[PDB]
Design a binder for these strands. Sequence first.
DNA 1: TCGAGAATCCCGGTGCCGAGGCCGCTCAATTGGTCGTAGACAGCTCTAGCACCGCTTAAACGCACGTACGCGCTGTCCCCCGCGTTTTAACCGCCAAGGGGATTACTCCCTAGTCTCCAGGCACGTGTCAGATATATACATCCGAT
DNA 2: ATCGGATGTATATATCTGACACGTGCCTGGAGACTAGGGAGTAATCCCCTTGGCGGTTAAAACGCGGGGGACAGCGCGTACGTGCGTTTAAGCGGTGCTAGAGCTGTCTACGACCAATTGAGCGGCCTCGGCACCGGGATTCTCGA
Lengths: 75, 88, 80, 108, 106, 93, 92, 97, 97, 328
Amino acid sequence: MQIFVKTLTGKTITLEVEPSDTIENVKAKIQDKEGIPPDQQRLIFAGKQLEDGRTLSDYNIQKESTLHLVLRLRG
Amino acid sequence: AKRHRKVLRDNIQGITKPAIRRLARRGGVKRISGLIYEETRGVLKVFLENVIRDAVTYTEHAKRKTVTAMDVVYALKRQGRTLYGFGG
Amino acid sequence: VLRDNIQGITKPAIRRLARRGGVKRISGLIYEETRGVLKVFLENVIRDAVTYTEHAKRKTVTAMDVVYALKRQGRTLYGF
Amino acid sequence: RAKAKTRSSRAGLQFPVGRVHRLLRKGNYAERVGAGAPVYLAAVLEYLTAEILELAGNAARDNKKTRIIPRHLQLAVRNDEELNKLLGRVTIAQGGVLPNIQSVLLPK
Amino acid sequence: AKAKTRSSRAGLQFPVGRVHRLLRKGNYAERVGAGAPVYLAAVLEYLTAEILELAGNAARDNKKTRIIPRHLQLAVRNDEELNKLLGRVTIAQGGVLPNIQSVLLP
Amino acid sequence: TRKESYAIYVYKVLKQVHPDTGISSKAMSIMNSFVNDVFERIAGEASRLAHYNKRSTITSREIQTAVRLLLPGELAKHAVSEGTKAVTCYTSA
Amino acid sequence: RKESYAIYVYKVLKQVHPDTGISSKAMSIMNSFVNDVFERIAGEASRLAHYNKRSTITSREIQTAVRLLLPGELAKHAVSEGTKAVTCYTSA
Amino acid sequence: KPHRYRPGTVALREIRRYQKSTELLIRKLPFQRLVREIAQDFLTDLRFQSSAVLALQEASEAYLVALFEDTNLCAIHAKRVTILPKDIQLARRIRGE
Amino acid sequence: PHRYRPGTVALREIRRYQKSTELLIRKLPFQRLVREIAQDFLTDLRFQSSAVLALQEASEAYLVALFEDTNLCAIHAKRVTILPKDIQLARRIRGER
Amino acid sequence: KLELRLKSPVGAEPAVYPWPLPVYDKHHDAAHEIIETIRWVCEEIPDLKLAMENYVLIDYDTKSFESMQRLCDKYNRAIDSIHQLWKGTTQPMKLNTRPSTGLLRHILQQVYNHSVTDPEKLNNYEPFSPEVYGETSFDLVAQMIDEIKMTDDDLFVDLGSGVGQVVLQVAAATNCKHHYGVEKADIPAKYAETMDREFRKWMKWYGKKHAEYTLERGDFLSEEWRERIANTSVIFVNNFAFGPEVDHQLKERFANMKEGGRIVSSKPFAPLNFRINSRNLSDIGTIMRVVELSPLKGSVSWTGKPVSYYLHTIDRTILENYFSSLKN
DNA sequence: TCGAGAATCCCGGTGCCGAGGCCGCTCAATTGGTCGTAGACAGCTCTAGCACCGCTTAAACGCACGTACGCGCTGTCCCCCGCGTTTTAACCGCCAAGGGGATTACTCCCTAGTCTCCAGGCACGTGTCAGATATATACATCCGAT
DNA sequence: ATCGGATGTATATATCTGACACGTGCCTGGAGACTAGGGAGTAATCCCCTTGGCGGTTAAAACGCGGGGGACAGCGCGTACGTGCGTTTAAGCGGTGCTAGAGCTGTCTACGACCAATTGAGCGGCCTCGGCACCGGGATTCTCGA
Ligand SMILES: C[S@@+](CC[C@H](N)C(=O)[O-])C[C@H]1O[C@@H](n2cnc3c(N)ncnc32)[C@H](O)[C@@H]1O
């Protein structure tokens, strides 16, 4: 299924995913599409950030959701 | 009271005009034209700032507040013009 | 045995060397003073090179000795 | 025993820290070389070589070529003025000079 | 045996052991050799005698007996073979050589 | 025998600042002498700097005092603002 | 309790001009000059000790460094006094 | 009838009169106030033990004298007698700054 | 035929030799000069070739800087060409004589 | 032992003056202060200047007690007469009006002369250390206010308030919600505790409402102040002698700020010509723009030569543009 | 070429403070022993510096010829020196406070040194492609001419 | 300012090559854990040295007025040097052939770090006195109007 990730610049990116994929695979797909390294990505939805070891199904995310992406520095 | 550290400002005029003329007569010129008396002040300010900005670092490294004469001798040794007669 | 080889640094080569620096007309007396300056500089560099390569008791002036002899005078040379 | 992990990776550097340590000990610069020093020394050397190589690659890309040849290094060192006073007494081999003609010698 | 300093076997005047204690604890090498600080004291004594002879020679010619630093200044720069050792040294209380150019004379 | 160099580290740091431009051999020798010369000058200044205060351990402060003396008045700020970021991440690990 | 080179310079003065003394500020100048020449010669012998993979400054490296630092005239007299000093120190 | 020299011969008295002597030339206390004003930067107040101030005066006087003795050569080379700003700016560029 | 004005082939040689980076002095005269000047010291030297090339690069980078300085010192006299009393001024201001 | 009791224009809290005046430098007197207050309150409302022009002028007698006594005794009956006029058919001045620039400068100078007693003691510190003290003038802070237009939803935090005239000028200039100033060493903070009280009393005396502020004492490298730095709009630091050690830690703690924030400093955090590539992502310079202010005179009070001030901004779109244009 | 007058070296008298020398006295130089190892010396393989020879030709040489510039002269004006008079702050001597520079003692944690383990980096092959050379060509530049 | 001829410079493709990116085996220098001895850190105390202020004396800075020597522009001439051309010479590339000498390895005699015992060479404090700065008074030297 398609979901959207809304960044700050006005651009909306749409990825095709399944609810059972891990977040690492989502970050890898975004890295494939836009070239942004996975370590810099901090995804936020409904005031709660997502953890590396959990999945989209753990947070009750659904079809046609809108996610917010912010950029953070490297370490 | 008033502010701390009564500030010294606009003090390049200490190297006055006949003093620069005397310094010229050491070198072996005859007539000094009417426009050396700014360029000599510029060159002197550049040289004193370029020595003091090394002496202050050499005296920061020991964490003391007195710029001692050994620090001026070392900072002049690092630039190229060494200086005898002061213990270094 | 070789002698009188300062005439190898010929006239148009010294003109080319002056051309690289940004001059226009070379007058007719530079072709002696430039040979003099070159002889003084090469003597003052090789007199620091041969001592360095004599200290190791070998008889070849290798390139590292020339790099050290230029590092002592003030113009250090990279690329080696 | 733990897993062997090199000291260059612990600080986020790229130049070898241990090589700089073995050079500061054997070079007789002091009696004892502190452990906090050669990380800092490797970091300063790595910053200086990045600042030269960025301008060198920029001058190489400007002149329609992809290999950096030493003429590009000469055209990148002398043209900037903040890097001139550190290299103020070097003659880079195969160098050449900046393109420069004075104002008087041009024809009227 | 009787204590006898190392200067007396050298036939020198500068001390020998001070140069040894400076060359070891100045970190110029790891192991400082035996025959070297004698040679170093020798070259140092010859250099300071070569300066002080010209210093006193230009000190007696000016009708004084205390070597004032101006005599040292007029003794280094008037020579030619020592001008390339102190060639970038500014001796304090020094002054310049007496020099007027050839065009300025009336 | 095998001789030491600084080659493959310079080639590694080139790829992080440009994607696909490699250096020729005689430029590699030039950078290999340049890093050696800057390291020689910095250590040779910090040696005499740790000698005028009667200490004997060239610590992580002597390099920070010598770098603000050797390099000019613009590169010094970036040199120390990278050196502190190196040492602080070295300790906390 | 700081050191100086005062008393030995005062000793070597009497072997040339036996009726003249030197002032204080000239003594400090000679004290700095001997210090600077010793600093330069040992600093050149150190860097000559690393271009040959050795580690002992013996009595040859000082001679090869003195033939480089001093100019073309004084070097002959310096080496012809130094080798006499070491061949006198050996036979004792 | 009031006695007056030719303009251009008091200078060739002052040349010998200042080359013979060896006193300090620039006035002391304005120079000390200048060298305290240059180090008025770096915020932390400094102290300037007086032997360092006199050492700095000897060094900052022995740098202008060589500059004028070189710019005299640069001014004589242009078939003139006096000096002028475009000779100091030539000597400082040829010297290597 | 066609003949250029005097003073225009030089201002093309300026660009043609500043754009390039080759060596200028021919090799086998320079190597014979170095081998002949080294006969005054210790006898029967050998001169490994990379030292000769390094020495040539140094000997070019000396004269290019000397000519680029003496051109400034000759432009200062409101002349265009150079002359022996400009090299013998620049080499004295630089501090080698 | 007598006083020189004045009267305030609006409200009733008369400030007092003991007669042996506090000594100043060789040309500054408290008579200048009292005459300057009288001149500024005459410039405030013109009816008092109309009562001031007749029977007396601005000139004085400085050593005598009775002349300044007559100054106060005429000024007090003038204020009481316009109090009687103010209870007639006219309505008073509106209390919620912020003052102008000159009245603010005079009030700040008055509080700084009255509060601290021996200002030579401020130079007692540790050499070449973070503990060093250097004051910023009134004029550059006024240009700082008039440069960035701060709105009703901002927070002004002053890292290193010093004695704390900076937060006073900010709280009297704009109209934000709250303000903060934090400092470590106790010797300026003990003067700051009296600076607060004297500023509140004098801005009550002139009848000028300000913003809110709390001159707090703490240490901003502990974990308490990290979330409070990262929740704030505009930050005023003065780090000309902080060195590189705490500078990197401020570089780390600035990274969690919001969008549209601003940071000013006497030393630039990110350089002016900062290019961006695939190596220096770890620095904070990749996500901020810098711009140099106007190098005007009278800037600091440790030298006379002017220094720049490098207004920053947080703008996370440069990283987005670079990561979009990596693939082209 | 000679007189008037300002400057400068010279000669003798006078007081002063910075060198020469002498004396406690302490800590760095000197003697006399070990013991570990850097380096003098021998002996070996083999890189590369040297001398020579031939062929192609790019470049060093001699020369005619025309011209832009080096150079000397004259003339103008402008600006910088000499000197007298009037401010001003430099310098010397004295008095007084206190802060920082040097010092001593006493801990303690960073760092040389040793042994053990192993992967980071270097030499070697091997492919393969960035540009060096070559050729055809459009646009800019210099030079006569209008 | 406007225009054509002629020459050079840069811009657009084709092949072909040797120098560069890269993978593999492997050795030794880097890393990990542990222990011992001292250099650096920190606190307390003395006391010398830097700043601050004042008051008197007066050298030297500040300012203005002639006026003469020199900066600077214009002009005219005569050599010296740029530019091109025909004749000429070593520069350079390759190829062969030789061997002195760079460089590595194996010993091991001699040479210098290190430490306890000993003491005199050399450093600070304190004195005495004369070389030397100062002053004033003529004797000689230099400059400038006639
Ligand atoms: C340059 S002053 C700024 C004073 C005032 N805000 C201004 O701009 O004029 C820096 C101030 O920061 C304070 N400060 C320095 N280091 C600090 C620290 N580590 N923690 C808290 N305050 C500190 C000092 O007390 C000092 O007053």
